[PDB]
């Protein structure tokens, strides 16, 4: 897949991207001289964990175009911006590794956090690697960077191997943390990046990111390997945390620069922990909106009290015996059969485990649109549109344009697995139904 | 409800009819001076037994028009003909009581048995009640009938009560077999028939039905009350059986003329027994056609042998554990998931008892039309048409005009109870599907 | 008269109904095993009282069709729905007696109260007939109900007799409140209902309506006979009133189940009271609504206060000299010409007596849409639609879709009697106009 | 080149494919973890042999997109379907290697063989990979398969190395059959497939295809290496051939899994043999079909026998002097002018060499549709449709919808080279004509 970010000469600039999974969007920004593919260990864990995963290759790397222009953090941040806006990502998590942490700071700083839920910095450049009279801490003098440039220009090919020696602590980590062949692929990935980008990248490393830091307004994670040869933990990791006290700080004991590949297990653990805090927070707000809509159709009373606890407890994660819950609903005197079907649907959808329970006749009968062909016809039409929706509100908005009979029939269609939509879109459907019924 | 059979003066002649239930059509032809309503005991048992029940009131009686014309068995038979043809009854059972047995003989005799599966004669007129030199047996001389006519013309109202005394053996049966109030209603029903019809009916009683008898080509039942004052068993019941040896003969020990109301339990028993022989015979032919279609999609082999026994055993009525059957199908190596869904559907439909088993996920998934909205759209369209069908072939014919995806989706729709059709129509749907698949 | 509600085999299902009188529509829903004719004592008082009276026979009873299907409250509710929609009843009063009270709760609960002004429950089933471990209230265990079914099978005819005495407390009430002849007619009516219907009705009695009750937003009346054997007052009457405290309650001291025929005087009094009170209750609220809209276009001041004081007085019924009122408006410095036209219109419409006065020149000139043909064209179009609406809000909603010029012209059209609409539809028209003008 | 098969989040899924050569279409479906490029030894022989060659990369491999969805044989079958339908392949040969043999069985089983002439299975998965109590045949228990998955997670890179040796029997085959460089390329190809794809592929290996096998109606080839570690020949190879006895079987003595690159000579021989044999097999059957249609219009006689003897001889390949044949036809007393035109056309079409002869005047005159513009108009319309059909029956079916005049004119159009269609489509045209004429 490609996203066009600009034009050079007669040929556009295209950034290779792959997007995976469903759920809260997590964008991974790779390090030098690798590509989106370097995050495979991170990607597999995020997919299992239930998160949308977006990866892209920075201009000059992996499968993106190889212009001879735009090697700067402003351009790189603008490249990121185009990706975000192209995909209309909201409530996204931005995770940068090495060079990628420069993108995360600069984007947040310049563009703001409206689409952004949280950020994570792994093996960070921050704050400022250039060692200057104004700031003593920065790791190396300018002469040192000038050094690398010269080395890459002399030989990209030997140079990648040299970076690998530094990058992975191969004397320490070979044959242990990772196989050599896996390492060999990384050289192949680097050899595959543009010749111009290879020599121009090292000049972006000593960008001063100190100004950007005060901007971050969203929860952050800082993660560094204490055995980091490439980016000394003290110069950046020690310093950055002091600049952003609030963000949780994790140190990976004796991890080299290449923690994710060498130390993917430690990285995933640390990252998923930090992400879980931001994920569960908006997960609850998803549950809460659903609950008000669901409660709106129930008559006020003690039963409405019992139901609310069930909505809240399963929502909070207490795995309940759906079989027990369903029998209770089924036998409740107060509820209308329609109401019981809606609740029946909600519970099976939200309960942690269905425990292989067969669908319930009381629900199938309640959500069948009176077996009316016109209701069913419209329900099938709605379903088609819902398959294209990805948010709760978009789903709820389109659903409200349908009659209650058609909405109930659509719910039965999903309930019975004759069709499938994402969870949040299903919530929007049942909420539009509740809204229509309550309004009656 | 009315069916127009003719014209008198400026006003048409309309026969009041009510049709009930679903299944093999059973037409009940009442006796004098009552209406279709007199068969309530017969009707309730036939409805529970699962038979379509058609009743109508003979011209001049109950709620039909009261012309001053057409009191003959040719007209009455032609009236019956119009009803049969109006409703397009096929494989019908004709049951006549008293006067109604004249309709059954004359219709069969003149029109043939193409729409007719079996006949039943209760408290029959047959063969010939007129006592003549040519036939000694006939119960009374002409002078006797002439008698009744004269009596009805003098007083319809007293006369009905007199008929009731004879009709029910009230000295024997009052306060025992039936309450007086129920008897009182019968007088009300009679008082409600036309004045002209009341006096003209008795003249049709000594119609010679001997010629008609040789025509009957369908299984018959003859049932008579040995305490029949109104139609002496020997003159008609004894004689008729000799004329039609083949038909089963049942004698209701000490039952009066009004066996059905007085003796509804004995009547129902006897009638349902005779009907069961004719019902089960075409019931099997319904199962057999379904089986060939179902078998046509299974690969030839030992499995196809195991499946056939299941089709045949459940079809023959051996209540099988559907849960056991379904698990077996589910775990069968040979069957395609589609094939297993079709069989899954067939078995749940034909098994005597489902034993409150939840619908199966393997079947729901197999019959979901790939969750495709166009398949579902067409399936809903087919369903609408199928709701209007009442036969296996009509259903199968319309179904074959739909694609396999739409047919499978329609089956899932019925399977999941999102819609409902009659059993034979559902068989036509699954058979059209098998036919389409086999042809592929 | 008949209204078709469905199809049974080859026949339709038709409900016999009667339309009488003019005025606010009152629909009477009879009890078992009687028909719309059983309300004759109530119907006569209502006609005298000036209320349109709609009666119908439930399927299986009196002169309606006698299918062998549809005997459930959902079916009963839907049958009622068809009647309401067929006749386009708005601001209707629904009165149910015994079984009929199940229809009232069901119709209100499922379909809402848009066509409904008030409900009345006489000798009510609710909330629950059944006696279960969950509920103290229920009158009897299931087995007795099953037995009543059983009694019908043995004797519909004979059964009616025992049922009538309990229904009327004949030992207490014969020869005083109720004549033998009156009772005889009731038996005849019952004997005339469908045989299938009589045995299927008793199964609908223990339907659970408790969930249903919370639904109603329209003033209700609960009326029960303290001597009612058929539906024990305390078991149902005490229970229902507790479930719906707001609705007015009347206990008829020592009245049996069959109270209205025996106790027609008490019934009429209670019913006519409830109707007159609920009517004036909605008239006053309706009047208040009109005043805010009318006042919204007037400038704050003494004149506005006068309109406020004057409106309120005529609204409260103080017959004012319209001639004096009109001259005052006409000569008001504060009043806009359009306001005088609007106020002029309002006053002539609401004043008790116009005293044969004349349409004001200013109103004629103020409400002429500037004599513009397009305004007049749209006003005629609006008028057509308004003739179809009996509700203040329906009228106001459709009116707001028209321009002010067209609305003013429409008002002139009504003012000048070139067209006619109900009063509350005329109020909606003048209110839409005020709303449009105020918004400008 | 790419073919889009679906959508994943914001991106489409594109399958990289290659189209080469001309002639009968042969589609090659690669094995894990390689790409369409792995068939290079086979592709070259086929091009020399004169067969169009279609290769594509399964999603997640070589140059196709790398979604995180769709890795199941139903998905694989549907991906293949899109390719076939996109290119409008007819009379195609499907050749699968390892994983690719799952596609061949799945496509044939679900979609049928309408576009398919023959199938070939090399180093096949089928019937069942899994070892279960039900089946002796399965190679391994589930846990080992789960473990292989586990290996991929630990090292995709390092994993490929061990896998390659088993795949190629490198201890046996290195430096002889297979070069180190060739092996290195294979590792590079695998390292290039999607990270998600590598771990998800092994789960599709134990798919059960036994039910699937019964489906095929098209000649098959089964080819296995007796030294194949990856897919034990006896466990799968012995089992599959027993399941499909009719299909030709070849065992490659001591060939590993990776046989074609090592054993390209044996592979080419076997494949080119199967292709040439299956082609002549369908040519002969096709030839026989043409003869019955052609003979159907001739009068019984010596001339008919000559057409029968002559047709058969040219059909069998005896190159006859068309000039001599044409003069004979031309001068035949028995032959109709139309028959000479039809036979004339058939002979020039089927004779091995036309020897630069000329279109017959009689054929030109016999096949001119009487020079009628409407015939010619329809013939041009038919021609357009025929250009789209590569199948004798598809051509014959569409042709039969045209009148004889139009059909004869169309034949003249082709005869005269004013238009061109395939040979088997031309046969369908002349056969539809014969059918129409014979029916007259």
UniProtKB/Swiss-Prot annotation, chains A, B, C, D:
Its EC number is 1.11.1.-. May be a chlorinating enzyme involved in 7-chlorotetracycline biosynthesis. This is Non-haem bromoperoxidase BPO-A2. Keywords: Antibiotic biosynthesis, Oxidoreductase, Peroxidase, Plasmid. It holds the Pfam family Abhydrolase_1. The active site is at 98, 228, 257. Belongs to the AB hydrolase superfamily. Bacterial non-heme haloperoxidase / perhydrolase family. It is an enzyme of class 1 (oxidoreductase). GO terms for molecular function: peroxidase activity. It comes from Kitasatospora aureofaciens (Streptomyces aureofaciens). Homotrimer. Residues 25-263 form the AB hydrolase-1 domain. One of its GO terms (biological process) is antibiotic biosynthetic process.
